[PDB]
Amino acid sequence: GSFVEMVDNLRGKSGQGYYVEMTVGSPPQTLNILVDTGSSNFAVGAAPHPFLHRYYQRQLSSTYRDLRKGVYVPYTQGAWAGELGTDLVSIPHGPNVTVRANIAAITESDKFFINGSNWEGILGLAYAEIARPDDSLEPFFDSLVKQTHVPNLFSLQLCGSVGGSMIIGGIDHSLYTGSLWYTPIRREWYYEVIIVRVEINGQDLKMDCKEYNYDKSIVDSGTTNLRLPKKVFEAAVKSIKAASSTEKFPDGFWLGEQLVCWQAGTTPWNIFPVISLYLMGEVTNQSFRITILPQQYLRPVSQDDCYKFAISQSSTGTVMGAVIMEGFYVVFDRARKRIGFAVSACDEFRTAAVEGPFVTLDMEDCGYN
Ligand SMILES: C[C@H]1C[C@]2(CCN1Cc1ccccc1)C(NC1CCCCC1)=NC(=O)N2c1cccc(F)c1
Predict the structure, then answer these.
(1) Residues 247 and 111 in one domain
(2) In this structure, how many other beta carbons lie within 10 angstroms of the beta carbon of residue 139?
(3) Minimal-distance CA residue to ligand 1 atom 2
(4) Residue 38: inside a domain, yes or no?
(5) Are both 162 and 216 inside the same structural domain?
(6) Using a 6 Å cutoff on CB, does residue 115 contact ligand 1?
(7) Which residues lie on this side of the membrane: Extracellular?
(8) Is the CB of residue 227 less than 8 Å from the CB of residue 218?
(9) 74: CA distance to ligand 1 center in Å?
(10) Do both 135 and 171 map to the same domain?
(11) Are residues 29 and 115 in the same domain?
(12) 3-class secondary-structure state, position 115
């Protein structure tokens, strides 16, 4: 294929995110950057930190332009503070272009960088509406499309030391099998989508579909888990427990407070159910479903394989994190305001699936207002 040089451009450590090499400034300064569809800022570590192997040195870059404005980005689990500026940016294993982009130089942080993750910055690929300090700070992808002829689309193949591909400007047919099924991007802020039905081993969870998207459902490459709103998490855990009753697990396992380990190569994948998420399709009353295996929602943490239940509670809507994305080739079709899912080219009894079409009525009632 024509996008061959972008294949395998992602690396990472299990549960520590996927990173791409990005070259900043003049002379070049290459750093490993977290690929995050759940945020909108391009920000790099710019001062020594115990968890950083390297950092951006603005004084060494002749093309760096200080924007003379600070920036602060807080989250529930951590935060960072820095200085705004612009500099020349290229992705050596990405598109063959160089752009002048906004860059936040991280000078201080709290619980943001991960010890041993091998990444030193973050590439927020979501929209300007959630950019900090505000929506006037143009995200990297917007700068890329405005300054070059690169098509307004990117796609991600995250393979569960990890690897993957970020194809910028198109779709690589070698990265998937079967058909690509599209769900609309409801609103351009996060990559917001609509889940219309949930099944555990083919059994309908039978909740009002508004609950699946309360207060939003997002596609986020930067979040490890499948995060579910409290009511949905509780019903989904109750159903998963019942479907996996051939073995008993402590309550704390389902809450992520306890891990369960098995002798190398003996994990009884067959005892755990498959999870199906139905997404709103592109045609009236049409939906499709994506099916997740336990190999995706049970994440590996000697002669023992330890696992964490990677489905967790949220009070800020559903988050379809790397747990969900890892079974699929995911297309962020920004030009047509849609997200595509296909079976990824990366057991003997079951496989992750993308199936359709299904008839689902009143799907418009599933969205939060
Ligand atoms: C950007 C952050 C935002 C993120 C999820 C992960 N990415 C990526 C990431 C960053 C650092 C380390 C690991 C992942 C988040 N996302 C929410 C989704 C729902 C709607 C509200 C936002 N909440 C958090 O607390 N996060 C977080 C997690 C760890 C460290 C950190 F500093 C922040």
Answers:
(1) no
(2) 23
(3) 222
(4) yes
(5) yes
(6) no
(7) 1-369
(8) no
(9) 9
(10) no
(11) yes
(12) coil
Q: Which helix (H) or strand (E) holds 241?
A: helix 230-243
Closest residue by Cα to residue 369 from 210, 230, 218, 231:
210
| 154-159 and 353-359 strand pairing | unpaired
Same domain, 156 and 271: yes
CA dist., res. 58 & res. 26, Å (int): 10
Last residue within a domain, chosen from 115, 150, 185: 150
Instruction: Name the residues annotated as catalytic.
Output: 36, 220
- Alpha-carbon gap, residue 20 to 8, rounded angstroms: 10
Task: Please name the helix (run of DSSP H) or strand (run of DSSP E) that holds residue 252, with its range, or none.
Answer: helix 251-254
CA 316 to centroid of ligand 1, rounded, Å: 12
Instruction: State the Cα–Cα distance between residues 282 and 190, nearest whole angstrom.
Output: 19
What six digits make up the tokens of 296?
């995706």
Tokens standing for residue 289: 């479903």
Q: Is residue 328 domain-shared with residue 196, that is, in the same domain?
A: yes
Q: Is 55 in the pocket of ligand 1 (CB under 6 A)?
A: no
Q: Is the dihedral of CA 145, 148, 153, 154 positive or negative?
A: negative
Resolution (A): 2.0
The residue whose CA has the least distance to atom 10 of ligand 1 is 112
* Dihedral Cα 261, 262, 263, 266, nearest 10 deg: -150
Within a domain: 3? no
**Residue 93: inside a domain:** yes
Total domain count, the chain: 2
Q: What method did the depositors use to determine the structure? A: X-ray
Q: Is the peptide bond before 133 cis (omega within 30 degrees of 0)?
A: yes
Contact status, residue 180 vs residue 344, Cβ threshold 8 Å:
no
Q: Specify the residue for token string 């990824």.
A: 344
d(CA 215, CA 316): 6
User: What residue numbers bound the domain in which 50 lies?
Assistant: 18-150
Across the strands, what pairs with 328?
A: 343
Ligand 1 and 70: CB distance under 6 A = no
Does residue 212 lie within any of the structural domains? yes
C-beta pairs of 228-231 under 8 Å, 24+ apart in sequence: 228/311, 228/312, 228/313, 228/314, 228/318, 229/313, 229/314, 229/315, 229/317, 229/318, 230/313, 230/314, 230/315, 231/207
